Design a binder for this molecule. Structure first.
Ligand SMILES: Nc1ncnc2c1ncn2[C@@H]1O[C@H](COP(=O)(O)O)[C@@H](O)[C@H]1O
Length: 715
């Protein structure tokens, strides 16, 4: 049933939903021609002033009976109003501009490590009100890459949530431009939080740093009693002032000028995925554009965002079931987690996939776990297997809009269809080297190139890298191979990076195989791997906890996995060479913490390579190396052993048989051996015994391994 209808029905029943319906008078004021970014924000936030804007889990400070005070979360959320959000943002800008010994002025850089929360959001806004350039850093970046980014940007202020404070300190000690360290998501009364700050200031004192440390609490309490800074900020370049850098990947900073940041705030990104009330959960760091799109789309539509309680997603279902969102934004790995929930719940009940009992599990997901108020849903940032899409769609009972886009280009398509605006022109470029051409069947393929109104001005302090991503006609080269399936309708194949050429000249799209194989019930996470010297694929598989218990982590989980991936291969119409033949089994999941997952939740190929690459190569190497060691052992001992043993071992080794299935009565034909492999075998035998053995003596169904051993001995 239609969206207008489902909304109308919700807003009759649900006063919370009714109060969150967008107000057009506010949107017209905030979006009018000429208004600078900071003024656009001020208009949304004052215009919706009384409404609930943001929500965090309520808590109480408990004592252990250790004695220590700690924050104990409650099954309840608490809201900060749009007006309260605006005040505290202004209190931050005011205190930062007016500081007595280390003030900050428009144009200066601020860097931040944090998750996503009320404080982080209010610091983002403070930055725009001050005209700062903000550089939000990846929560799982190593300290080395944090220092490298702090080097390029030279920030004057460094902000960090309590839990990243230690890595912030390390980075600030290596970064002479940093004058202040601000500490946020800080809770007065919590002993962990107080001792983190005291450790930060001892560490800085001990190294003799003059870097000042303050919590955001205190910054705001000071700012509150100060006059507001004047809008818009006195930057150098109006709408082209550099407002944000988003780091992408080696890390490059994509420049977001004020006019492109403004698109998050009620501009072109609301097309990315009637007057719908926006109530959303946010699980995505502000380090990544997906965090922003939800967060600012909802701020700018007068809705409410509910922040997930813990960085590590361990409170996911509880928060969704309390917050009961109207809009869902997913990424594949989140849909996979949902699918993994359904599937382990399916084992535990002992029900099959098509059944009423399984449909109740879905119903539970839809009504309880996800809150039962879902009106729309979208996904993006990585490719979704069609099976998973249909699963999510059946659970939610809405269409899952697919949005393709990038940090660089902004939103590019929505359910295959170019989003115009901002896209003005496009084309496909052939990629001969990866075997992709506009003449291909059944569809034209190649690299998508675009001209778009939201294209980045460039990468920060990287003019050469900036020139690499445009072709001679000024089209942006997405790096992404696509398939045109109808006029101006595209489907994603893969990044150019992710396409591998196997040694027999077949081309694989690696990220597409991971999406496909991620709906194996045995698979928790998968990374597929290739080498151009090899004719088959490997994979790094984290099996599910259930698979581990049932099969272990040795040959039996590999063999089970194999069957499972074969079955997807056949069902999806993939080739035999697209199925991995062996595995590295990992019992410890890829995480953001580990460096294997990005802040968006994507599996990072080069981080898999750096960790597992050696073990994977050694696994490619060992197959032929064992066989070669055996052939050499047999060559070396043959002038002193029963000719029949030689014949058997040679046959076993060459074809891939266990000694068990090599009987002296077996036919070379039985053990997998065509007449091409019989010539290799004849040559081997000729080399060690000095006697001629025709390929007739091996392939003839008259003969068997005694027959062969017989022939040789008669000479
Ligand atoms: N909806 C989507 N489907 C498939 N791949 C996607 C989608 N959105 C983004 N991507 C991939 O993610 C990249 C964006 O990377 P980033 O710059 O980190 O956001 C794109 O260039 C694609 O390779």
């Amino acid at each position: 049933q239609s969206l207008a209808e489902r909304v109308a029905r919700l807003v009759a029943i649900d006063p919370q939903a009714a109060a969150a319906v967008p107000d057009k008078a506010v949107a017209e004021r905030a979006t009018q021609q000429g208004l600078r970014l900071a003024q656009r924000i001020e208009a949304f936030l004052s215009g919706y002033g009384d409404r609930p804007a943001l929500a965090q889990r309520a808590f109480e400070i408990t004592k252990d009976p250790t004695g220590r005070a700690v924050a104990t979360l409650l099954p309840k959320f608490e809201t900060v109003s749009y007006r309260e959000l605006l005040e505290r943002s202004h209190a931050i800008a005011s205190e930062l501009a007016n500081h007595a010994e280390a003030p900050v002025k428009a144009g200066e850089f601020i860097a931040t490590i944090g998750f996503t929360s009320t404080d982080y959001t209010s610091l983002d806004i403070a930055g725009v009100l001050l005209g700062l350039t903000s550089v939000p850093l990846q929560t799982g970046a190593t300290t080395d890459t944090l220092k490298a980014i702090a080097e390029e940007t030279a920030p004057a202020v460094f902000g960090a949530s309590v839990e990243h404070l230690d890595n912030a300190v390390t980075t600030a000690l290596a970064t002479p431009s940093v004058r202040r360290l601000l500490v946020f998501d800080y809770r007065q009364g919590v002993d962990e939080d107080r001792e983190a700050v005291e450790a930060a200031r001892s560490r800085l004192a001990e190294a003799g740093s003059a870097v000042l440390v303050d919590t955001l609490d205190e910054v705001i309490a000071r700012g509150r009693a100060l006059p507001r800074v004047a809008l818009p900020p006195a930057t150098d370049a109006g709408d082209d002032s550099l407002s944000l850098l988003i780091y992408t990947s080696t890390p490059k900073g994509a420049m977001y000028p004020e006019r492109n940041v403004a698109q998050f705030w009620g501009g072109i990104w609301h097309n990315a995925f009637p007057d719908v009330p926006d109530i959303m959960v946010n699980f995505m760091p502000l380090s990544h554009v997906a965090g922003r799109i939800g967060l600012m789309g909802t701020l700018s539509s007068g809705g409410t965002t509910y922040f997930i309680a813990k960085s590590d997603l361990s409170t996911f279902f509880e928060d969704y079931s309390l917050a009961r969102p109207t809009k869902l934004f997913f990424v594949p790995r989140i849909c996979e987690m949902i699918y993994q929930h359904y599937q382990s719940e399916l084992d535990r009940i002992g029900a099959a996939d098509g059944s009423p009992q399984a449909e109740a599990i879905k119903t539970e997901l839809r009504e309880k776990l996800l809150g039962g108020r879902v009106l729309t849903a979208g996904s993006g940032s990585a490719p979704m297997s069609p099976e998973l899409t249909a699963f999510i769609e059946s659970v939610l009972q809405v269409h899952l809009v697919d949005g393709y886009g990038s940090t660089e280009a902004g939103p590019v398509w929505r359910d295959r269809k170019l989003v115009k605006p901002p896209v003005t022109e496009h084309k496909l470029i052939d990629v001969p080297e990866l075997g992709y051409f506009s003449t291909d069947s059944p569809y034209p393929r190649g690299e998508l190139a675009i001209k778009t109104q939201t294209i980045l001005p460039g990468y920060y302090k990287r003019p050469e890298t900036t020139a690499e991503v445009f072709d001679e006609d000024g089209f942006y080269l997405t790096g992404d191979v696509v398939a045109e399936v109808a006029p101006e309708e595209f489907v994603y194949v893969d990044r150019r990076k992710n396409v591998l050429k196997l040694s027999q000249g077949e081309f694989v799209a690696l990220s597409k195989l991971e999406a496909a194989y991620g709906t194996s019930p045995l698979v928790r996470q998968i990374s597929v791997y290739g080498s151009s010297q090899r004719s088959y694929l490997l994979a790094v598989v984290v099996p599910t906890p259930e698979a581990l218990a049932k099969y272990g982590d040795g040959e039996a989980v590999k063999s089970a996995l194999g069957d499972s991936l074969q079955k997807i291969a056949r069902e999806e119409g993939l080739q035999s060479y697209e199925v991995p033949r062996d595995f590295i089994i990992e019992t410890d999941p890829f995480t953001i913490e580990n460096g294997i997952l990005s802040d968006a939740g994507k599996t990072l190929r080069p981080k898999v390579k750096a960790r597992y690459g050696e073990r994977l190569e050694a696994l490619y190497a060992q197959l032929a190396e064992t066989q070669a060691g055996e052939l050499r052992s047999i060559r070396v001992g043959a002038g002193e052993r029963p000719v029949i043993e030689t014949v058997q071992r040679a046959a076993a080794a060459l074809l891939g048989a266990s000694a068990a299935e090599v009987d002296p009565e077996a036919h070379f034909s039985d053990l997998g051996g065509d007449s091409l492999s019989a010539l290799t075998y004849s040559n081997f035998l000729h080399e060690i015994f000095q006697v001629e053995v025709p390929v007739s003596v091996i392939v003839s169904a008259a003969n068997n391994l005694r027959s062969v051993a017989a022939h040789i001995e008669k000479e």
